[PDB]
Ligand binder design. Structure first.
Ligand code: K
Ligand code: K
Ligand code: MG
Ligand code: MG
Ligand code: ZN
Ligand code: ZN
Lengths: 468, 468
DNA sequence: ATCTGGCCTAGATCT
DNA sequence: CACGGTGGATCGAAAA
DNA sequence: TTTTCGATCCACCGTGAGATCTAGGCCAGAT
DNA sequence: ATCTGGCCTAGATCT
DNA sequence: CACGGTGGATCGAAAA
DNA sequence: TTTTCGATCCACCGTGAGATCTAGGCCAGAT
């Protein structure tokens, strides 16, 4: 009937960041100027705004939180993606999988102390191993689906609780159904900040490995993220700690503390290396930690690997192995896809050269996972393990929330303001809606060392400054 | 050629409060959706945006201020008003007068301490004594033309200086010219806050009157506002002070301080009346003033006349005269047009009854002007002497400035940010452009005493809460 | 065993 | 510190 | 030889996220 | 005439 | 304190 | 008996303007 369907009038209503009064006056002005058939009435705008929303028996909002039963959220997603983005019957019976990735990160608000929001972005819709739907910008806020949030300060406690709830809700849900098609789901946990990577990674450094219980007895459990968390998520901290053991034990060619005369000299070396690091680069190190195991910021681990030569000279760990750790962690943290066989052989040779540089000191668990069993988990998931919003992207999504809380919710009962935040965080995410953020500025790419670009593939949609 | 002329695409661009990127994406999206002939290109948007701007040899912006030579501003105004809002040759030679009113008021910003902006709103365009153009909402920010501003704290000093500059620039300018029509100008100063009314009114209470040098020798000088300022602008303060003299002299039936035994009892009465007022209503009074003549806030004068009965009992001034002062000041402050003969006879009878209530105390100068020569100045100007933005209106105009400073200027050299503020404060004012603010809420009208509504005419465009 | 007394975490302030 | 966002200046292609 | 059209520049000011400094509640020496 | 000492104006905080 | 601004709920007219 | 259309409601949260409280520089009693 009209030029703009409701499904595109909505896209306009979002991209221009328009209020209800603003859209109503826009359409009314276009009408008054003689043209009559361009902008759907708000009635239809909202009648599509409803098909963007899940069944209201599943959206549970309270004055403190808003939770969408993941089942309904995934049903909604796989319904919208079809409803517009596939010419139907392109496949008749081929299996469908909506490969998606989720997570959360608190962000202060400058009461509403700091939002803490689970989040979900549909990455791809694959059929029988073939692509039907691809996300044009997997690090852009275009497709951030909210699963739940609540205005609680992001302690370790609220994080561990929310992760427990969400990781059981994930195990629960059943494949979704749309127009005679039975779509299964695959969710990974990669929307993790650094702080949260510490809060979750610091359960304990456990002395085991599942595959190694050399040969393999193939039995795998990929779910609940524990594999990815322990192996590669923001292992950097552990790595800086792990090697540091050697940086102290550099005297007696062993790990234990049972020796006589080993321990006093070992303590003194810890002393002097900590004094050296404190005087040359002013970075606090493991020397002060009493709770939940030895732990440091991501600040210290990053600034450790931030320059290979300087700290490599400092610690006495010869510069080449620190070069290798810096480059492989640069690969993980980079945000680009990991080429399986090249990264795998780089890691295998790094392992070989490392063990033949230090064989007295056996393989530390976290590093043993990162290097030996490292690449095959990027393989079995085909993921970007750091995959999460860019600096400009997370900045835009947090400004999205602050806008939808301050300008696009209704200042009533408080059940409603959170209800509208949740609404617009679905609408603005709808895989069905065209949505145009202003064009980014071309930034010089993240300066990378001379041995990583072969591990990455720089045909890219990302432009972050300090992380990715 | 296209549905929206540039002159209406601009109206849309403003009313929706749209940025340049937002308008460009709006038009581009409408284009991409198949319709091609609706939204002018930004090139034409801006080519009309130029005809909204005065000749750039007159806009003088510096890192501290922005001043438009009033001549150019009035030329621009009388050009735009014709260019769209008159079917030409409706009159061929009849004289033209753009009756306008101006003023200023500082407003803090919550560096950019507080803007202090001259302002101008074209009220009417009259021809040979007949209306051609009428302002639909003379208290709305729709037509606020900026003459100059500068980010300076609003002392009495900057105000008196800016008023001197503007009142000489007004005397200077020459009738404007548009398409064979020679338009003269008439500007009044009514865009005055209360604070500014004090800062200007407190030159001195001078012992004279021009008409009275009983009969009249007709010689009049209406310009420079001095008449309106001294006579009726926010005289209320003076009135509360003037009568207060009697409220002290209630003992000896005279004005002077030469008596013996008069003065001590007079001081004691001042004491006790000040103690009574301080204990019953907690309002500070004239008793403490050492500089620039006796002066009080508008707070105290208003709260004085805020209830007739209570303070009327307190002061000993019989309640009826205070009823009359309250009602006539309510008329001035009300914001509604003043019916000349009814208001005039009300004031004449108030004068008669007052002098026959207190004749010992001669007519104080400010009150003598307000009541005896009072109405004829509303006559010779046909004005709303309080005419100035409403609460919601001034709130919207100050939010206009904060928006055009924070969102619609360019963050460059600072010559430019002020240049764009000035631009959009002209554009958003253009008498040529349709501009739709969101619809106001119906408020209960300002509660008025039972003898004023005959002085006002409540066929109204105004909806303020505390002032008008 | 008490009396205050040098440290380990949240707000405030850089960058 | 880094980046986003301002609206005009400027330039080249194009329209013609 | 004019207008129109689009992209890019200009360059700084807020903002904001991460990252550093600064104030109050708890296990060792003397009675 | 000096030495500090009770008041009259700007920022901060209600409403 | 007062008012503006939120987007949906609800209702009546209307479309038909 | 459905959809569509418009206006009005819901009612509270920021904001903001005016209006109140709170900290530093100047003319009288003793040397
Ligand atoms: K940032
Ligand atoms: K107000
Ligand atoms: Mg975080
Ligand atoms: Mg003012
Ligand atoms: Zn293993
Ligand atoms: Zn007179």
């Amino acid at each position: 009937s009209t030029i703009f369907s409701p499904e595109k009038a909505l896209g306009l209503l979002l991209s221009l960041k328009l209020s209800k009064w603003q859209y109503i006056t826009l359409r009314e002005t276009t009408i008054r100027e003689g043209s009559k058939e361009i902008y759907p009435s708000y009635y239809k705008v909202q009648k599509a705004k409803l098909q963007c929303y899940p069944p209201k028996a599943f959206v549970a909002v309270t004055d403190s939180s808003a939770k969408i039963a993941l089942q309904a959220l995934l049903d909604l997603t796989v319904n919208r993606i079809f409803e517009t983005i596939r010419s139907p019957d392109a496949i008749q019976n081929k299996q469908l999988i909506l490969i998606s990735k989720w997570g959360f990160d608190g962000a202060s608000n400058q009461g509403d102390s700091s939002i803490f929001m689970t989040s979900l972005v549909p990455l791809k819709l694959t059929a029988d191993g073939d692509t039907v739907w691809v996300n044009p910008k997997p690090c852009s806020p275009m497709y951030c689906r909210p699963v739940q949030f609540s205005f609680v300060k992001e302690t370790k406690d609220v994080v561990i609780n929310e992760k427990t709830a969400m990781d059981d809700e994930i195990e629960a849900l059943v494949p979704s159904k749309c127009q005679g098609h039975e779509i299964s789901h695959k969710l990974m946990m990669t929307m993790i900040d650094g702080k949260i990577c510490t809060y979750l990674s610091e359960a304990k450094s456990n002395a085991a490995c599942y595959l190694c219980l050399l040969d393999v007895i193939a039995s795998k459990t990929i779910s609940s993220g524990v594999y990815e968390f322990g192996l590669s998520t923001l292992a950097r901290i552990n790595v800086m700690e792990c090697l540091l053991h050697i940086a102290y034990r550099l005297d007696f060619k062993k790990w234990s503390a049972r020796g006589e005369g080993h321990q006093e000299l070992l303590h003194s070396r810890k002393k002097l290396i900590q004094d050296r690091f404190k005087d040359d680069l002013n970075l606090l190190i493991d020397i002060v930690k009493q709770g939940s195991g030895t732990t440091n910021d991501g600040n210290t681990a990053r600034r450790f690997f931030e320059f290979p030569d300087k700290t490599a000279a400092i610690t006495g760990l010869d510069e080449d192995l620190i070069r290798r750790f810096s480059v492989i962690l640069q690969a993980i943290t980079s945000g680009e896809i990991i080429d399986v066989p090249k990264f795998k052989e780089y890691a295998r040779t790094t392992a070989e050269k490392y063990v033949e540089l230090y064989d007295w000191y056996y393989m530390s668990s976290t590093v043993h996972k990162l290097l030996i069993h490292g690449g095959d988990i990027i393989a079995e998931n085909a993921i970007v393990p750091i995959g999460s919003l860019s600096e400009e992207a997370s900045e835009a999504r947090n400004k999205d929330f602050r806008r939808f809380r301050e300008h696009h919710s209704r200042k009533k009962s408080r059940q409603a303001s959170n209800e509208d935040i949740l609404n617009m965080l679905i609408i603005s995410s709808d895989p069905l809606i065209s949505f145009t953020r202003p064009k980014l500025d071309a930034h010089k790419r993240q300066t990378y060392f001379k041995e990583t670009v072969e591990l990455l593939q720089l045909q890219d949609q990302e432009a972050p400054t300090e992380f990715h």
